[PDB]
From a paper:
Titin is the largest protein in nature extending from the Z-disk to the M-band, and interacts with a number of sarcomeric and signalling proteins. One of these targets is another giant myofibril-associated protein, termed obscurin (OBSCN), that interacts with titin at both the M-band and the Z-disk. Obscurin and titin also interact at the Z-disk, through Ig58/Ig59 of obscurin and the titin ZIg9/ZIg10. The Ig59 domain is only a part of the titin binding region; both obscurin Ig58 and Ig59 domains and both titin ZIg9 and ZIg10 domains are necessary for this interaction at the Z-disk.
Residue numbers in the entry: 3 to 92
Amino acid sequence: RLEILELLKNAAVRAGAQACFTCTLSEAVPVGEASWYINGAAVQPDDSDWTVTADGSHHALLLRSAQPHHAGEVTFACRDAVASARLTVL
């Protein structure tokens, strides 16, 4: 079974700063199989604010410059695994 070894963590960042959400899976799953969401909206590959990466077991969602409207619930979903945490923008 696919497991999440390391779950997302809540993050609080100042406006303009970088935020990142990461998780680690039990096996290497290509980035194409993962879906990230902010407040229920799927993150798109041409979103100028958010970057999605994967390296082996390690998946990440990066926000280079946080703004207040980015705040809310981050979801990661891959196969049957789901995780969530919260972005707070100070």
